[PDB]
Amino acid sequence: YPQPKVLTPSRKDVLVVTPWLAPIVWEGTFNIDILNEQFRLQNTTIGLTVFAIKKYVAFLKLFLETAEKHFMVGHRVHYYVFTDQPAAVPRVTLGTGRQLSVLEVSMRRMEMISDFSERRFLSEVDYLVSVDVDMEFRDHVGVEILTPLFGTLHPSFYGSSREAFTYERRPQSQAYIPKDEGDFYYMGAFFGGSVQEVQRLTRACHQAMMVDQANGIEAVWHDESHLNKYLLRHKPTKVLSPEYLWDQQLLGWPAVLRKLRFTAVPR
Amino acid sequence: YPQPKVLTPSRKDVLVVTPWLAPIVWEGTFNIDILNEQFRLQNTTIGLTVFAIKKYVAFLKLFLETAEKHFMVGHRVHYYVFTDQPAAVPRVTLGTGRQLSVLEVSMRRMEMISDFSERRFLSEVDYLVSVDVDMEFRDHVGVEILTPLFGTLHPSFYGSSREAFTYERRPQSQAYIPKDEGDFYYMGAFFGGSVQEVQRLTRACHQAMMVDQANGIEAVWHDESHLNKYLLRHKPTKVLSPEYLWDQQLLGWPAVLRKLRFTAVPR
């Protein structure tokens, strides 16, 4: 219960709020005890979707074991594993209040989250988070991320000028973003929000991808390109810092990262 | 459309986000163009309530003329003037999309906002803001403040330690806050939020004041004491800086204030 200090920035090295007043989530900006209590009072349930198709099933065991140690501990969690191999899903032991469902299955993540968010998820979960499976948790990822809509700063681009962002640059594409436009480059590997905002986003990105396909065009970075266009027009109500999406082998451990929470393991 | 810069704090002198990740609103933290568009897309209507009882009617003309120049310009605004003298309300000319209603009338602000927020306001307005009438606008006060629930940092106390906060300290009072507790000292002269959150707050503070009265007790700073207790337990989703509530004669123009927006003129 340290008293917040009005005259001392929570960080002096990084931007902790966007120009539309969305928090940018970094270590030092939040008190987890306050936040945990706010979300427990609502009995919050968090859905986490992950796709593990073909060879990617090999990633699930470490993904699930580390999510058990770091993800939303103390809160209700429902993992949704989309896989082409139901029997290759490992039996990881889960903490109390946590469950896993197997859902048997470029355009494909968006469409499938969109279909299932309109069935099951509504309904089962208050927030939906969508990540890649070839990842491991190494530190706390909790209710600090939760908000109607969020994206995550891509670890390769957070220091970049917008012209260097690998947005879709061809105006023939639904994901087109002009050269003088763009707040941030968001990574496709970590986004989420309330179920409603997630249904809206994945529905938009899936509808935009079909339009692009009917026109014989594929956005340069696929659903990530559409994600960026969607979050340009519908601004996230929190942005995660790259603590939440890192590759240490590629990028090290710079000084602005006080924690590496969710990292790549060596669409 | 300057690109937000990830590696440069929007401010280096002040805290721009609370530990529960609510934005603290200061000049330099927001782009008004982005925000104006977000709220216009929803056709947002802002209610502003002010009490002008007895001698305080003399404050209304400057209050209204300066609100016309600075308050929510470009958005729909409904002023609600609670007064004991209907005919002493000056006929200030209003910009398009803006209207004023006269409502003829310690415990009294909370109860009356609570009654009218449940009738008229619902209904008429998306957000309700409640200020004192002995004030003038001098600079921009816009949709940057709008959020489910906000309070404002009291200009006298934002540099203070919590023990020096003039919270109600007697445990016999509903407004009691213990010595080791407290985030901020909020001023009673500027609070608001969505109509629903305002109905909840004013209903809580009014019910708590009756309880205190039935027990022969009056909180040290009256409804302000209850406001602080309410915002301790139900944390605002934005905090306004003291740009939004200043007294220049008393306190000058310190360096951390880049704008004085809404000020005292020389319950």
Ligand SMILES: CCCCCCO[C@@H]1O[C@H](CO)[C@H](O)[C@H](O)[C@H]1O[C@@H]1O[C@@H](C)[C@@H](O)[C@@H](O)[C@@H]1O
């Ligand atoms: C060693 C290869 C370096 C590639 C770094 C840039 O990351 C890629 O960026 C594009 C958009 O410009 C996509 O976002 C793509 O998925 C990113 O690659 C993945 O992320 C990086 C950080 C690293 O883990 C790569 O091995 C991933 O394939």
Ligand SMILES: CCCCCCO[C@@H]1O[C@H](CO)[C@H](O)[C@H](O)[C@H]1O[C@@H]1O[C@@H](C)[C@@H](O)[C@@H](O)[C@@H]1O
């Ligand atoms: C010259 C008198 C100085 C009083 C400053 C402290 O302000 C008062 O603080 C209490 C709580 O401790 C109440 O919030 C009270 O309404 C405040 O006074 C008003 O605000 C100040 C900034 C100044 O404008 C006073 O003249 C007002 O009466």
Ligand SMILES: O=c1ccn([C@@H]2O[C@H](COP(=O)(O)OP(=O)(O)O)[C@@H](O)[C@H]2O)c(=O)[nH]1
């Ligand atoms: O054959 C595949 C290709 C992709 N994916 C899923 O989609 C993600 C994105 O691709 P990778 O992770 O293939 O991309 P980068 O994240 O671009 O390396 C993977 O993590 C998996 O979750 C999968 O399950 N099987």
Ligand SMILES: O=c1ccn([C@@H]2O[C@H](COP(=O)(O)OP(=O)(O)O)[C@@H](O)[C@H]2O)c(=O)[nH]1
């Ligand atoms: O006789 C009164 C006393 C108070 N008020 C209203 O309640 C506010 C709070 O009191 P003052 O402004 O009297 O207090 P500080 O804000 O404590 O000087 C005033 O601005 C008016 O809006 C009023 O209208 N008539």
